Amino acid sequence: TYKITVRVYQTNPNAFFHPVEKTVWKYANGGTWTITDDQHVLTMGGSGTSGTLRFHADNGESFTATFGVHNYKRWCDIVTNLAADETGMVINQQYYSQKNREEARERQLSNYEVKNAKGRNFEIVYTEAEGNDLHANLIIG
Amino acid sequence: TYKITVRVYQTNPNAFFHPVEKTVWKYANGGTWTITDDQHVLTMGGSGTSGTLRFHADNGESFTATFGVHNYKRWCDIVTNLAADETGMVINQQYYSQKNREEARERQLSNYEVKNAKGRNFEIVYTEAEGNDLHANLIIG
Ligand SMILES: CC(=O)N[C@@H]1[C@@H](O)[C@H](O)[C@@H](CO)O[C@H]1O
Numbered sequence: 072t073y074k075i076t077v078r079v080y081q082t083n084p085n086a087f088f089h090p091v092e093k094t095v096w097k098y099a100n101g102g103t104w105t106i107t108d109d110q111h112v113l114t115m116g117g118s119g120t121s122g123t124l125r126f127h128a129d130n131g132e133s134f135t136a137t138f139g140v141h142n143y144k145r146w147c148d149i150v151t152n153l154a155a156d157e158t159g160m161v162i163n164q165q166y167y168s169q170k171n172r173e174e175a176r177e178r179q180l181s182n183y184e185v186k187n188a189k190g191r192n193f194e195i196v197y198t199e200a201e202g203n204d205l206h207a208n209l210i211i212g
Numbered sequence: 213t214y215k216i217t218v219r220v221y222q223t224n225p226n227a228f229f230h231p232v233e234k235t236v237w238k239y240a241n242g243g244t245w246t247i248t249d250d251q252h253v254l255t256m257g258g259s260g261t262s263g264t265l266r267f268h269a270d271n272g273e274s275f276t277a278t279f280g281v282h283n284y285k286r287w288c289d290i291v292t293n294l295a296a297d298e299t300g301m302v303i304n305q306q307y308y309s310q311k312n313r314e315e316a317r318e319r320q321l322s323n324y325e326v327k328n329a330k331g332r333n334f335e336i337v338y339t340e341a342e343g344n345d346l347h348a349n350l351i352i353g
Pocket residue numbers: 148149150151152171172175185186187
């Protein structure tokens with residue numbers, strides 16, 4: 072099994088984001104999202120699956136942060152500028168069907184950042200980036 | 213918009229279930245799962261969508277409880293004896309393509325119960341079953 076423990080950092084007082092969806096993809100015997108000490112903990116049955124957290128702010132901004140393991144190496148991606156019909160479960164499935172998402176997963180990134188249309192930065196950084204007990208920061212700008 | 217507020221009653225000390233996935237379907241401008249006063253709150257953009265909570269117990273038992281609005285009336289369904297590849301997001305999507313799930317949704321039930329292979333009962337009952345501010349108990353046997 073693989074575990075990814077996620078700590079969320081919010082740095083900008085002009086918004087407040089909160090989790091509104093948490094999904095687990097069906098490969099590698101699935102998995103579970105739970106909470107321990109205010110951290111989001113994804114446990115997966117083996118290498119080859121992932122889970123997505125969707126966040127929403129009062130001002131209408133939203134994004135997904137997806138975490139997984141591909142051929143025993145961690146990966147992550149952020150999708151911003153979400154339309155109302157781009158829920159977390161829609162995005163999570165796309166990592167195994169849609170070319171640009173698949174390629175993001177295949178990059179096996181220990182860190183990734185992107186800006187939305189409003190210019191806000193979002194970053195994931197794995198602070199424990201190897202082995203079966205993985206830890207990442209999600210930093211919202 | 214439609215809101216469904218869910219209170220979880222665990223009645224049997226021989227197991228302990230906790231939520232491990234919370235998904236939102238893409239129709240009707242999607243929606244959001246949040247928590248207020250230990251209650252799971254689903255808000256949806258209009259009629260025609262739903263959200264799934266998956267629960268897991270440390271003895272290996274699990275189930276999905278899905279809540280939504282179909283043709284302006286609440287619906288619910290429970291799926292248990294889940295295979296490892298039947299995550300919450302898998303089940304949630306099935307309500308919009310798999311005929312038996314579609315039919316369960318279209319029944320617009322305000323009350324439903326079912327047993328798993330171990331003989332445990334699971335029940336959803338809407339205590340406020342009318343209008344746009346809906347309230348349900350999820351009762352674990
Ligand atoms: C601006 C933005 O969010 N771009 C995302 C990018 O971060 C992601 O790597 C890619 C593939 O999933 O999808 C894009 O929509």
